[PDB]
Design a protein around this ligand. Structure first.
Ligand SMILES: Cc1cc(C)c2[nH]c(=O)c(CN(CCO)C(=S)Nc3ccc(O)cc3)cc2c1
Ligand SMILES: Cc1cc(C)c2[nH]c(=O)c(CN(CCO)C(=S)Nc3ccc(O)cc3)cc2c1
Lengths: 600, 601
């Protein structure tokens, strides 16, 4: 499905984020039978969108709810819309959403972190008010991405269990909008930017227009047109270019025009001219070895859950700018597109990841599970199909973002059973055909080591999650150092791939200080991080370090029973722990994007 | 002036809350001279609106900045807006704002918590993009509401000093919006709803139209038309009505139409049919004695400052619904209008207050160069009074139709001991009564200006007493405080025979601090401190309200934080409950709704 992000000019957007919506629980699952979308929601209350519904109400019974919830709101179509193509779009409805315009079912979606839209022109009269009803479901099963399993007790009460660390927040987490286009419109764009030794060259264009003739022009930051092209595709611009570089992120504007006999459509696409490639043990941006610094993150904050917020990304970005982070990873689900836009504009490198986390029954944090992970009753052929679909929707959404340099199709799957490689090999090869321009990865769980892991050879970059090393090493630092280094070297011998440690750190209660440098203390977090740093600087194959996590986040419970939820460098209200200043000195102390010399 | 809150009707709005604006500091104050609005802001950064600019960037040098900041943003004007009147509106720009469309200066405003808008039709071309630049100033002087004084040191670096407890957050704190109307449009509406022993009547209106004929229709919640009328202002409608009551807040819809016969304009106004009146020592809503419970609040949250936010509004209301608060006060400044909208719909009682706080030089928290005469040319003067009156004007005209607002508070804790005091406030008190006779009026009293020394309280209808800091003067002793408090309350009862609301009480409490000794800063002491007030309240007939200070921990100025008083909340800043939250809940849900406990408690 083609998706382009809405921008304004021959097109227009009316944001429906005006938060307050009618909101209801459907504890008896009678909402569909009684067609709640036909009238006003009964016994509803005010809720804010975007935002998770879970923490908005200080109510535990709502927070831990599993099943269907209902959103509802009336909105006016502008008068001036008539004659235009009118689209209703949800940037994200977490897990499942079904939408009604008045009484007409218009769209449906499974997948909680990517947009979905439908042409609603025949069901609205511009200038009138229309009722919009959304049925949102938060249940996970073996075919959802991520997977989980629902447990219904004797009384028929549902309770959600799952296998990832973060809390299962749900609701309309991101922007809802109506947007307009001419009946002739640009429906899809794909751009590839080749570079050759940085004095030269090119921007390849493939464009799909639902119904028009295509012209294309490229302007710089000064708006000087620097190249032009004709045709639905084949376009191969010619440039002596300002390259999209980490830390700067120069952007061109690719204006795409689509001409009918009577109508024209103009679409501006931000373009960053840069190359990404793996060469041996190195990751190359613009044919230069890059060293990642930064975080695994989460979409998590007080009150709003995974709900999107402008003040929050402004603040968070000022923080990882200050600390010297040049990169991050969209940990365990696709993020709101605004972060990617931010990264594009500010030259921030991003590892884009699917919501495929929890394909693992051996994590061991917890208290009726299938014994075969890859089997009909668990991860099956439909799961693989859902997994592939999740990869499609992520790539189709983010293929043009210069900030995205790699695709992560999963996080910490158990790769020890035999059916593992049969599951992932097709996904890995489908991913390469959906987007050949970017290296591919699958984030490795630690107990699936170099000796036991079966799938990593299918990918381009080795991303290692090392977080719970403090558990297995019982907190001993010098056993941890020698164990860490020999495992990293073993991975370097098995694969000869560039290595990024995408998770490392330890749970740290802010304000706990110790003279013994022991667990949960701020001092231990510093010493624990510092040992990873010393080892990284002695291993040539390591090209990246991303700390887990940026800030304390709410966890499943689940993880909170080990407690469990203090993994951040910052607190949830974004206050720095002492380790924040340790990272700042290391990350601002090195030459930008340059691995430190052997060793340090 | 003419302010009506935008609704979609014949009128359309494009929110400019698409938060990311261009943002820059102006430390050399060259922005106006180099005419920054003509081009794109140089060396700017992304900022979010609505929101304070202070805490968005983790930067102290930006947080403590005093002077001009610049906002800038490009936006497309809708295609179907051609032929329409196009207005550019800011719900609030905190303290001062000046706005440019492209190169055309279109508006200017002083006052940080009330809307201002301008017809920009001749300066925009529909279907094209226009550059919008806002110069925002956060400086306070003796003529601003609230007042303060700016100090320029050795090096010429500005530094802001002021007299209120909360931090001087600034920026575009609330919604920005372009909206449209037909060239014939409803420009103002005023509604007064009379009630008489609650079985019947009445609704008087007044509508100002720039240029059209007026029809008026009133529909109930079922959308049944229940009354109609004609004329620009003649309506005095007749109903056997469902009255707006605390805890429910039934609302009617008054549809106002303005007709040319090439153009028509329709405006829906929510109307709550209720009466508010003082009679002796009682506060009457719909001729029924009402008892206030709840909080003094603040517009304060992590990261965003005083920036407005829907999730936070939903959560806080879930909390003070749960806790049994039936009311609150817009402490020390006008709040965003959405809150009043919430209160109207949910039947929540509100004391609406101006930003006139800090008219006092004797509070004594902080370290130094202050005028000796509070009411004089060098301090609070005649121009200050004019700004003060202007602030009252803008508040009332914005909130005159909100049924949740049951009284106006024109000031908070002014020093009334100096010589110019009664001369300053008496005109303001009477000007306000002329602006809206329908609502009782008040001025929140500082404790040191007691019954013997206060000179202005007789000029008002309801006595609002701030008793926070009782713990300070009483050295934390509970039963001396209990004895002092009861007598001061009785002293006020004999001097004035006004109904008494305690609008501030509580004590600074470090969340998570527990003590076997029930000492200061501990949660156990806070519960014990609050309870002593409750016992005294239940012994005084004149007390008709208790509002705790404060709802949640909020950021304070350095002076207050040097004594470290930013822990005044019942809840923390991230909205976690202290043990007192559960004490108030049991008391407030335990009493009959809106009913003062019987004598004894
Ligand atoms: C903090 C903690 C607590 C408990 C109760 C655990 N039990 C386990 O089986 C395991 C298994 N294990 C050790 C490998 O030999 C790991 S590293 N489990 C793991 C858990 C969550 C992840 O995201 C990754 C790995 C770890 C563990 C950790
Ligand atoms: C917690 C605290 C701390 C300090 C350093 C003080 N100095 C005072 O002179 C005063 C003056 N005072 C006692 C005479 O009744 C009061 S009540 N001052 C006051 C301060 C702020 C207000 O919002 C209200 C009153 C109080 C005070 C309180």
């Amino acid at each position: 499905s083609h998706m382009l992000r809405p921008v304004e000019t021959p097109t227009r957007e009316i944001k429906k984020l005006d938060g307050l919506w009618a909101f209801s629980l459907d504890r008896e699952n009678c909402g569909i039978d009684q067609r709640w979308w036909e009238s006003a929601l009964q016994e509803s209350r005010a809720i804010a969108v975007p935002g998770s519904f879970n923490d908005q109400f200080a109510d535990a019974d709502i927070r831990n709810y599993a099943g269907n919830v209902w959103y509802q709101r009336e909105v006016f179509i502008p008068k001036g819309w008539a004659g235009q193509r009118i689209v209703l779009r949800f940037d994200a409805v977490t897990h499942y959403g079904k939408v009604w315009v008045n009484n007409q079912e218009v769209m449906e979606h499974q997948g909680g972190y990517t947009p979905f839209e439908a042409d609603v022109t025949p069901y609205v009269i511009a200038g009138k008010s229309v009722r919009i009803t959304v049925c949102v479901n938060n249940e996970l099963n073996w075919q959802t991405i991520p997977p989980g399993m629902v447990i219904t007790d004797e009384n028929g009460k549902k309770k959600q269990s799952y296998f990832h660390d973060f809390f299962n927040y749900a609701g309309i987490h991101r922007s809802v909008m109506l947007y307009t286009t001419p009946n002739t419109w640009v429906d899809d764009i794909t751009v590839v930017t080749h570079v050759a030794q940085d004095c030269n060259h090119a921007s390849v264009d493939w464009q799909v227009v639902a119904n028009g003739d295509v012209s294309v022009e490229l302007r710089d930051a000064d708006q000087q047109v620097v190249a032009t092209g004709q045709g639905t595709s084949g376009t191969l611009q010619v440039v002596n270019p300002h390259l999209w570089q980490p830390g700067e992120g120069y952007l061109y504007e690719l204006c795409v025009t689509a001409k009918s006999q009577t109508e024209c459509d103009i679409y501006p696409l931000r373009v960053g001219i840069r190359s990404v490639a793996v060469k041996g043990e190195q990751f190359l941006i613009n044919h230069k070895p890059f060293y990642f610094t930064g975080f695994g993150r989460h979409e998590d904050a007080d009150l709003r859950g995974k709900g999107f917020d402008n003040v929050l990304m402004v603040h968070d970005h000022a923080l990882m700018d200050w600390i010297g982070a040049n990169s991050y990873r969209t940990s365990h689900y696709p993020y709101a597109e605004e972060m990617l836009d931010w990264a594009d504009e500010h030259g921030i490198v991003v590892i884009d990841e699917t919501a495929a986390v929890g394909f693992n029954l051996s994590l061991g944090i917890g208290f009726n599970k299938p014994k075969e992970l890859y089997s009909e009753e668990a991860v099956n052929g439909e799961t693989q199909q859902a997994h592939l679909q999740a990869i499609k929707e992520l790539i189709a959404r983010d293929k043009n973002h210069p900030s995205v340099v790699m695709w992560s199709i999963a996080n910490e799957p158990d790769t020890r059973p035999q059916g593992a490689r049969e599951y992932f090999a097709p996904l890995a090869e489908a991913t390469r055909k959906l987007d050949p321009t970017r290296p591919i990865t699958c984030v490795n769980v630690m107990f699936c080591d170099a000796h036991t892991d079966t799938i990593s050879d299918l990918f381009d970059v080795l991303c290692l999650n090392r977080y719970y090393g403090w558990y297995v090493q019982s907190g001993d630092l010098e056993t941890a150092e020698k164990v860490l280094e020999k495992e990293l070297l073993a991975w370097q011998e098995k694969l000869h791939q560039p290595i990024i440690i995408t998770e490392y750190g330890v749970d740290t209660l802010a304000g706990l200080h110790s003279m013994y440098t022991d667990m949960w203390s701020e001092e231990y977090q510093c010493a624990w991080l510092d040992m990873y740093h010393r080892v990284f600087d002695r291993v040539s194959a390591v090209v990246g370090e991303q700390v887990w996590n940026f800030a304390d986040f709410a966890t499943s419970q689940g993880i909170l029973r080990v407690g469990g939820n203090k993994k951040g460098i910052f607190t949830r209200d974004r206050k720095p722990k002492s380790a924040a200043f340790l990272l700042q000195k290391r990350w601002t102390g090195m030459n930008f994007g340059e691995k430190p010399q052997q060793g340090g």
